[PDB]
Structure 1
């Protein structure tokens, strides 16, 4: 997440390994059932796209479902682009780009950039947007199994 450090400023705190292990456990025992969704949301509060991807890639052994979730995310990422045309121009020092779907998904965006979009007045909540795409994919695979 992005937390206040020991010095009060907004920083990237990584994700807790035990919270990751807790997620892995939930999916290992319960599998992708309706119960796994409230859990994921609860364990991903404040998470960056990178943190959300860490949670997904730690799921060691649910291949067909993970491919289904990935496609759903990629669809939502493609929808974002279609609904969000980019303003041409060079980016100046100090600021950054408009995030594309691939950026919100963390595939073409650094943690530094995601933190930048999140820590903005008023922000591009790339963590909360991506999480919504993941929750929709979860609902899909949660009704498949």
Structure 2
């Protein structure tokens, strides 16, 4: 990453082996859960595109997901290059050139250009865009990985309310719909799909249903 020295320049620092070891361990042990995206965004903070490419290449197995992620990165780079013209010709000294999409991806550049783009005035953050693209790809992957849909969740007769709401909120975290649709479904289908007894309990609870009130009502 790029560690900021205390009262000094933001010196570049190679990714420690601990970061990559934790990353390969989590991607091996936990497969592709919704939370891995937060842990990936946590481990890689202020990292150059070279660091992110190293973190992605170290992943072993699940090569279909890696190919989908690379295809998503390619689509985002194509869109960026289409909606942003690239200048050429002689460039004034002390000012880096226009970052290209294939260049903002880090596939057609070295570490020096990335460090220069992340140190210019005003700063042009390549890391926060390449990480955004990787997060979009990982979101597509975790959506693809979800085994069951959100509309097809039904509580079992003996399965309690806690396990049902756990599965429901997990699938909701895996869902791809917009945030307003997410609020709509978590407002309606939660009580609209419960078991009939606690369904009538929550109907007696009426409007303004709040999760803690629901779980305190369905007790026993």
Q: Do Structure 1 and Structure 2 share a fold, with TM-score over 0.5?
A: yes
Q: Which runs of 5+ in 1 are unaligned?
A: none
Q: How does 1:1-145 map to 2 (within 5 A)?
A: 1-5=1-5, 8-144=8-144
Give how far 1:7 is off.
Answer: 8.1
Q: If you compute each CA radius of gyration, which structure gives the higher value, 1 or 2?
A: 2
Instruction: Give how far 1:70 is off.
Output: 0.4
Per-residue CA shift, 1:22-73, capped at 9, x if unaligned? 0111110111221210010000111110000010001011211000000001
Deviations 1:85-144, CA, capped at 9 Å, x for gaps: 012321233222111111111111211110111112211100010000000000000111
Structure with greater strand share of residues:
1
Contact (CA 8 Å) 2:87, 2:97: kept in 1 or not? no
Larger displacement relative to structure 2 (90-99 or 107-116): 90-99
Q: Which has the higher contact order (CA 8 A, sep 6+)?
A: 1
Q: CA RMSD in A?
A: 1.4
Q: Structure 2: where are the runs of 5+ without partners? A: 145-220
TM-score by length of 1: 0.93
Q: Distance in 1 between matches of 2:56 and 2:107?
A: 13
Q: Mean alpha-carbon deviation: is it higher for 5-14 or for 36-45?
A: 5-14
Using the TM superposition, give the Cα deviation of residue 2 of structure 1 relative to its aligned residue in structure 2, in angstroms.
1.5
Deviating more after overlay: 123-132 vs 26-35: 26-35
How far did 1:80 drift? 0.6
Q: What do the CA deviations read for 1:5-28 (whole angstroms, capped 9, x no partner)?
A: 488222211111111110111110
SS in 1 for 2:11: strand
The whole-number CA distance in structure 2 between the counterparts of 1:105 and 1:32 is 23
